[PDB]
Amino acid sequence: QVQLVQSGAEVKRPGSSVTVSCKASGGSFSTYALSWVRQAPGRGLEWMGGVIPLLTITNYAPRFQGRITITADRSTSTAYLELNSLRPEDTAVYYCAREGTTPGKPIGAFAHWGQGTLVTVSSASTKGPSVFPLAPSGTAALGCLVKDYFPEPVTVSWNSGALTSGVHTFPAVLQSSGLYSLSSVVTVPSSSLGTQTYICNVNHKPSNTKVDKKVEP
Amino acid sequence: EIVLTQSPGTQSLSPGERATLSCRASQSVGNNKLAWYQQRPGQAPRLLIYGASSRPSGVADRFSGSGSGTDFTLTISRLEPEDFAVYYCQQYGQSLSTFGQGTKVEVKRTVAAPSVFIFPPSDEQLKSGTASVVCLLNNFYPREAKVQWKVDNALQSGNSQESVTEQDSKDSTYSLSSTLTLSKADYEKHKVYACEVTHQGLSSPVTKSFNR
């Protein structure tokens, strides 16, 4: 019944301000508490603050007091988070979350979550990756190195999705340049190297880089 | 500020086993306003328990919450495959709400040593002026592993990065990839490129290497 839909990913320069929106459908927007929660890459959840729209009563975590504004527009059932003075440490997925109801009495705890909004704080420009083979030397390993792209994400398949067994696609790492790199590998029978073709399909939508790299011995 | 401590931060368990996860608060939580959430990779958290012991409709009754004051427990009566995930506690008994750091419930399996592979840079990359050397540690368990790069036997620092996959849904192993990067000119100064791997499954370290 209640659905929260957030605005899309954004790249922001250091020192800038970001606004993230959350449009709610279902239930009662004005009388239920809406909070923002963020999660930095590979890290835990952090409650940032919330608002109760009917009352225009905000509640910010002390860590963000002075750097955040949460507002709500009853005419569009939209809540907004503003976070200022951005730094690399603010790179995170930002979630809106609304308290649940009993089977409506509010329960405080967050039953309804938005899909999240990735905010990347960086001075980097959009860049498509170079795709390099990791050539195979009973079992062989081979792969592709997807180097120097921005921003996230990249997707990788093998043989147009026909090859999944034995595939490992690793989380990206953020290089000193501010560009990302990732690798994808597969292990296969050594005997298949003569007869079977292995192609890594790399997709980086922001740069329109769509490479199907044949990896051979 | 109330600090919520979830210890241990990982539990390795088998399917079908009981799990009990602890959340200890630094001060008493107001009116037992303690919630538990599950989170899977790539997904928003999902509410399992609120008010220390109340369970939303929709949530499986194998999850239960108990405790009061400073001592709370999430119990999973019998672990299903989908229950291997991260669990967070949250207190909301005062205006400053806080989360615990999370406990990952992961699948226990037998120790598996990594299979190690090293990949020289491609000729394509070298043409462009840069050399990336990759080391793969494949299908190991448990997660803890260490890679060290050595170039003509000199231990490298600051010129590599690594990452680790989520636990494999079929065989419950992990894999790790490390990339060492140099300029082409620096790469051409050295002969032997080696990655040295340490893991519980190995009685002594394994080195894979090539000569440039």
Binding site: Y32, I52, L54, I57, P106 | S95
Partner: peptide, 14 residues
């Protein structure tokens, strides 16, 4: 506790 406000609102609007 700010997290109790909406419960109060609910009670008074019934």
């Amino acid at each position: 506790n700010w997290f109790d406000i909406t419960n109060w609102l609910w009670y008074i609007k019934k």
